[PDB]
Structure 1
Amino acid sequence: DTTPRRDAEYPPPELLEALKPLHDICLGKTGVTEEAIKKFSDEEIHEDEKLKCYMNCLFHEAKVVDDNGDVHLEKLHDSLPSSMHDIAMHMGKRCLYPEGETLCDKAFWLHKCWKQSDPKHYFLV
């Protein structure tokens, strides 16, 4: 099943809460719309350059990046609730090696790869 799962247990409320201030920071900086975030989360994969940089910004603000600003998938995994560790692993197992010229391109590459892999459990806020 590919329908996004959105209920009281998933996405983990603690992760949603933790992401709220990072959302404020990154939406402020990039000027992405809330609509574009919601559509990417719950509807079709779509192209929006500010959204790509919004995705990069969340990784940077969450401190899940290396010295070059590239996503460090282990740091990212560590930062997620343990309840979603297995789902996350499977979502990212064919998404190890982002491609793209810029950090925004590579961040978007990751989100798109995850959403293609597990659209039910992929989300973005």
Structure 2
Amino acid sequence: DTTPRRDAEYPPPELLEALKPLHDICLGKTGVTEEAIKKFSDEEIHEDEKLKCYMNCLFHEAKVVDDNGDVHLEKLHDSLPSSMHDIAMHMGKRCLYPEGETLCDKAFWLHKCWKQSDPKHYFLV
């Protein structure tokens, strides 16, 4: 099955709360639209360049990047609620090695790969 899980327990409401100020910072800096984000989260993969840089910005603001700004997958996994540790592991297991010229492209590569792997449990806010 592929239709997104959205209910009282998933995505973890406390993670969603935590991401709010990061969303404000990153949406403001990038100029992506709230709709672009929700369409990527809940509907079809699409290509929006400002959305790619929003994705990058989130990783930086969440402090899950290395000294080159590349996503550190252990840091990221560890930053998630324990309730989604298994789902996250399987979502990411064929998305270890991002490709792309810029950080925005690599950020996008990761989000696209996750959503392809587990569309039901993938979300973006």
Classify the TM-score, shorter chain: over 0.9
Aligned equivalents of 2:122, 2:80: Cα separation in 1: 13
Written as runs of structure 1 = structure 2, the 5 A alignment for 1:67-78 is 67-78=67-78
Q: Note the C-alpha offset of 1:42.
A: 0.2
Aligned equivalents of 1:13, 1:111: Cα separation in 2: 20
- Over residues 24-83 of structure 1, what are the superposed CA-to-partner deviations in whole Å (9 max), with x where a residue is unaligned? 000000000000000000000000000000000000000000000000000000000000
Q: Note the C-alpha offset of 1:122.
A: 0.1
**In the alignment, what sits opposite 2:90?**
90
Q: Note the C-alpha offset of 1:119.
A: 0.1
Give the structure-1-normalised TM-score: 1.00
**In the alignment, what sits opposite 2:65?**
65
**Which 5+ residue runs of structure 2 have no aligned equivalent?**
none
**Which 5+ residue runs of structure 1 have no aligned equivalent?**
none
- Over residues 63-118 of structure 1, what are the superposed CA-to-partner deviations in whole Å (9 max), with x where a residue is unaligned? 00000000000000000000000000000000000000000000000000000000
Count of residues in correspondence between the two structures: 125
Q: Note the C-alpha offset of 1:121.
A: 0.1
Identity of aligned residues (%): 100
Runs of at least 4 residues off by over 4 Å: none
Q: Note the C-alpha offset of 1:6.
A: 0.2
Aligned equivalents of 1:31, 1:106: Cα separation in 2: 19
